[PDB]
């Protein structure tokens, strides 16, 4: 659009289970606070999934 400018910008939205989703709002299944914001990220290891 005119009168906006010469550069554009967008918003990439990372999914919940992605290693880029780096945040501090995370509570583990036992109700304690955890460092990682997501659940397990992009890991495959079945132990870290269960």
């Amino acid at each position: 659009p005119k009168n906006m400018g010469k550069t554009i910008k967008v918003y990439e939205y990372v999914p919940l289970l992605d290693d880029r989703n780096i945040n501090d709002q995370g509570i583990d299944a036992n109700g304690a606070h955890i460092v990682n914001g997501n659940l397990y990220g992009s890991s495959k290891d079945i132990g870290t999934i269960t």
């Binding site: 005119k2 009168n3 400018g5 010469k6």
Partner: protein, 50 residues
């Protein structure tokens, strides 16, 4: 001293003459401008710059 004073022998006495002056006035030209580019009115913050 300078009063117009006539005698009985009226003749060539007390002559007066008049003068006519003039006042002038001219005409002058002014002006100014400003330049802009389409790249300054197409993508610019304000919509009604012009």
């Amino acid at each position: 001293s300078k009063l117009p004073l006539l005698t009985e022998n009226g003749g060539r006495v007390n002559r007066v003459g008049f003068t006519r002056l003039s006042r002038e006035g001219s005409i002058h030209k002014f002006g100014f401008f400003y330049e802009f580019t389409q790249e300054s009115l197409d993508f610019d913050s304000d919509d009604q710059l012009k």
